[PDB]
Amino acid sequence: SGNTGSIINNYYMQQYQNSMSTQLGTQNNDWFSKLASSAFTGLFGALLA
Amino acid sequence: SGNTGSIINNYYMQQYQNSMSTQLGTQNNDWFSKLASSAFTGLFGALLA
Amino acid sequence: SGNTGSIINNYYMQQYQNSMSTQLGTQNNDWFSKLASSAFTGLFGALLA
Amino acid sequence: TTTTGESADPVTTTVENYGGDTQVQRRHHTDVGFIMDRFVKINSLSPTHVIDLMQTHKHGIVGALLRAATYYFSDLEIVVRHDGNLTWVPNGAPEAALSNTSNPTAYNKAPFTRLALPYTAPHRVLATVYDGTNKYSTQLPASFNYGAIQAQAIHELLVRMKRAELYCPRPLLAIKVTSQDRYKQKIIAPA
Amino acid sequence: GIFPVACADGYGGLVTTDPKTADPVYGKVYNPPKTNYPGRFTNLLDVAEACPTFLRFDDGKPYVVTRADDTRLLAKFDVSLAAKHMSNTYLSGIAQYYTQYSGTINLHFMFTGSTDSKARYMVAYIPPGVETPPDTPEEAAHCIHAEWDTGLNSKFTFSIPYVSAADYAYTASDTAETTNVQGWVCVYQITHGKAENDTLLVSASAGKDFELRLPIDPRTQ
Amino acid sequence: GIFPVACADGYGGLVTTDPKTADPVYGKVYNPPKTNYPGRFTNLLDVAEACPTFLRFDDGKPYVVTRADDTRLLAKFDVSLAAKHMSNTYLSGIAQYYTQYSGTINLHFMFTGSTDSKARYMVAYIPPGVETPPDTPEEAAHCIHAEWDTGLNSKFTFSIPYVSAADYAYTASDTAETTNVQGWVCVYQITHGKAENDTLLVSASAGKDFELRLPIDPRTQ
Amino acid sequence: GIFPVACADGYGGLVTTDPKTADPVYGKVYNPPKTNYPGRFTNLLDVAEACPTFLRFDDGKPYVVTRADDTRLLAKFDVSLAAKHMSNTYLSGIAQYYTQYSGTINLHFMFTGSTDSKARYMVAYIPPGVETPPDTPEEAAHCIHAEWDTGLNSKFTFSIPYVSAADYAYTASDTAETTNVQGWVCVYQITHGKAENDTLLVSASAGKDFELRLPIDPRTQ
Ligand SMILES: O=C(O)[C@@H]1O[C@@H](O[C@H]2[C@H](O)[C@@H](NS(=O)(=O)O)[C@@H](O)O[C@@H]2COS(=O)(=O)O)[C@H](OS(=O)(=O)O)[C@@H](O)[C@@H]1O[C@H]1O[C@H](COS(=O)(=O)O)[C@@H](O)[C@H](O)[C@H]1NS(=O)(=O)O
Ligand SMILES: O=C(O)[C@@H]1O[C@@H](O[C@H]2[C@H](O)[C@@H](NS(=O)(=O)O)[C@@H](O)O[C@@H]2COS(=O)(=O)O)[C@H](OS(=O)(=O)O)[C@@H](O)[C@@H]1O[C@H]1O[C@H](COS(=O)(=O)O)[C@@H](O)[C@H](O)[C@H]1NS(=O)(=O)O
Ligand SMILES: O=C(O)[C@@H]1O[C@@H](O[C@H]2[C@H](O)[C@@H](NS(=O)(=O)O)[C@@H](O)O[C@@H]2COS(=O)(=O)O)[C@H](OS(=O)(=O)O)[C@@H](O)[C@@H]1O[C@H]1O[C@H](COS(=O)(=O)O)[C@@H](O)[C@H](O)[C@H]1NS(=O)(=O)O
């Protein structure tokens, strides 16, 4: 979740507390996370340390 | 049920919360559900696809 | 009981919630129930049905 | 699909007939028990009021739907805004009993009183329409009610059908259309 | 933090018939023993079944008198817990506190004549649907009925059956009711031999399936 | 001590559609049995599927009449639950209480002519994107359509498909809408033989995937 | 009795950032599927790392121009998310909503000259503790720095390190601050060969350990 910090389980059922998502086919469809992790970190060329 | 979305079990007994049904003989006595499911879906006659 | 329909157990102990009964000897000392059940239901004499 | 229509046997074709794909349906909102389970208001009131679901407005979602059924059954919930204390009495009771406190009586507590009441009629089911030649010893038998309430003053009354059961459907009508094509109205939209 | 709670509107008020209990304030009291105290009753209908009480006829008598003339109808009354004839019974005393009933009501007839007084009676249940009850045994014969005569056994018991459109019937009667909704009971005298001025006591009790539901507090206070 | 509790602001008010239940006050009531009572329905769409009701044409008739002249368009209407032609159907009666729909709507055509009356019809779904519907079978041929003729079987059923940009469509129509958002249905008469003044009844019912969501109470009260 | 409860003072009020949820009133709504919708991002710093945006120099240009004269300092700016030169970056756009940061900020230099234009640059991080930044590569050499030249690869990336007294630094700058608390970055031009009027684009992005904490809503509304 994000910014909910209550320990106790909700008194109302999920189908009342929220809208229900449907699918056709929450997965790893995080484009920007992939993009960022793919960033080049090395060093192009030879090194003299 | 229908339009009740509380998780917690009721504080009052069922014989107080509601009237009690009696029988002489909730079953599948749903006429219209049967009627609708019995609807013809095919195609009368020969087909050329 | 009679006309109490709460599911949850009482917060107060029984010796506080009610007076305590004592015995010298709730049993089946129901005179009228016995009397009623003892009622004659048959048919005195011979029958022609 | 062609069929013998005079028989009145149900026929339900699908888009597959011409190459389509029938989709998935979720029909929770058209569930009878669910749809009838919401508060509806009763407009006419008085210090002494006999609970009759037919006093519901004929065009409201609950009243329209109830009238689209011949017979029905349900338990009930009521919200009453009243002055003084509220007394309820079951179906079949002498109107005079309403003055007595030993019948379920709710002492005034702001802002109103919400209560759960059981079905209480002597019939197995009730009706929205009754074809009586008379029915005595467009009128409904007096036994068709959920009891009565009384207070010093009854300002507002909401009623809710619980565990509703509907039988033998009847005509349900949309607004009469005057326009040449569609009934158009102002649908909500942001400013 | 602490537990969040929503104090709900429309809940919390005192209802005189509510299913909760109050909080105690004076504990540890032990009662004197009442083990096996006699005459206890736990359901009003047990005593209503076991103890029949009397009906009220003519000028306030618990009995009906054998007619010396050629009229054979001894009594006629509404099958109603609110009937004048039932007004002094224990059965009607309990019934006034309930809105609906269903089931069997039993009538008892106890002959009071001398050994040399003989008679033959008939009791009939006239269901609703006819304008006035028949004053003749011949017309009433077509209904559910029982005939009995006098002899060693002085009492005869008959069950008024519950036959109605709805599953329950009202205990009270509305002002707009002309004819009794549940019909009538007619007691006839087929004949008698030297039974002039001899009496037939009649009482009522609850039958095995008699039932009262929906408590009510209707009397003027 | 006792359990601490925070009575939260913004919670507790009565909402007419809330998911809670009231507190009871009158217990132990048993209802008359209604076991196997006939004609029960649990979902509005079961009856909307099983019982097609009639469309409204011309001067208030549930049918369309075969044209004697050289005009071939028998009827044209908006694919809208708020259409004038659908205004008397049970389908539109239910639909007014919901904000959105999706799925198949079925049309039924029942020929009413005598044995010696023959005809050939065509029904087409004109999707949105064109300014006015075609009044010619030749132009409408390029759309999704079906043609059928007269014979032993008097009824023909066709499915109006749900083809739209969004996954759901509004049941109601906004005043700012010129052209119907979901297009039209056009019924044509290819030809006929001695079918003058003969009728074609047209009705509608919910298809297998027809769906209504989001309950609403919109009528003036 | 019932459960005793202490309604506590000082608890219950609405706090706009509270960790609770409201009570529902309209249930059972299923959303259209949005499975695999493209371009999703779950953390602001993923896009801040992957998409570098441009710095602002001189008269509003995303680049620095090679000097024709004998001055070698191309640019000098405050290592501050509130710096004028960073004012148009996405990094500063996000940073304004947080009170503190820590970690690496990356600078990218992309040479824009023709094939026959050559140059040699140097970038240095001048930490705090000196009154004014050096305008000479010779003086700046003693700091952490990198030198690179022109060639087949047009871009060069350098990490501005987080070196400070406290573990976190403020994103905003106080009016009482004379010298920038976190120091400066100086870009120099060692030399060039026919690179007059040729450009060096400079952009910034979040490094691997860049971090923003403590959300804030500071803009005038
Ligand atoms: O007016 C009556 O009904 C007369 O009442 C009966 O007496 C009651 C008595 O009134 C009552 N006291 S209370 O203060 O009213 O509570 C209590 O003591 O009980 C007795 C018995 O009542 S019972 O219900 O009949 O059992 C007379 O009975 S008694 O006095 O012999 O004990 C009863 O005979 C009276 O009824 C006669 O009068 C009625 C109306 O009176 S009038 O016409 O206005 O003058 C009349 O309607 C009755 O038909 C008539 N009884 S009859 O069958 O003999 O004709
Ligand atoms: O004004 C109308 O729409 C006329 O209404 C229809 O009659 C209704 C009737 O009004 C209604 N009673 S209520 O109080 O309004 O609720 C109820 O009884 O139903 C009937 C049937 O209505 S339906 O929706 O058409 O099924 C007339 O039908 S009927 O009387 O034969 O039963 C209908 O023919 C009338 O519509 C005509 O007039 C419209 C406007 O009238 S005017 O121009 O101001 O004078 C016009 O817009 C319609 O086009 C026209 N119908 S047409 O197709 O024959 O031309
Ligand atoms: O006053 C300025 O800062 C001038 O603003 C920039 O234009 C803004 C424009 O004002 C803004 N619209 S808004 O209503 O303010 O939101 C929006 O359109 O963006 C542009 C670009 O702003 S940016 O932050 O620089 O990217 C001028 O740029 S542009 O018009 O070419 O697009 C910018 O050049 C202006 O700044 C100059 O003037 C400043 C103060 O003006 S004055 O002395 O009072 O007359 C001065 O402090 C700046 O140094 C000067 N820029 S310089 O580097 O060329 O010298």
UniProtKB/Swiss-Prot annotation, chain D:
Residue segments, region Antigenic epitope: 64-72
Subcellular location(s) of the protein: Virion; Host cytoplasm
Signal peptide: none
Role, per record: Forms an icosahedral capsid of pseudo T=3 symmetry with capsid proteins VP2 and VP3. The capsid is composed of 60 copies of each capsid protein organized in the form of twelve pentamers and encloses the viral positive strand RNA genome. Mediates cell entry by attachment to an integrin receptor, usually host ITGAV/ITGB6. In addition, targets host MAVS to suppress type I IFN pathway. Upon acidifcation in the endosome, dissociates into pentamers.
More info: Contains the main antigenic determinants of the virion; therefore, changes in its sequence must be responsible for the high antigenic variability of the virus.
Subunit structure: Interacts (via R-G-D motif) with host ITGAV/ITGB6. Interacts with host MAVS; this interaction inhibits binding of host TRAF3 to MAVS, thereby suppressing interferon-mediated responses.
Protein name, as recorded: Capsid protein VP1
Shown chain mapped onto the complete sequence: 726 to 933 of 2332
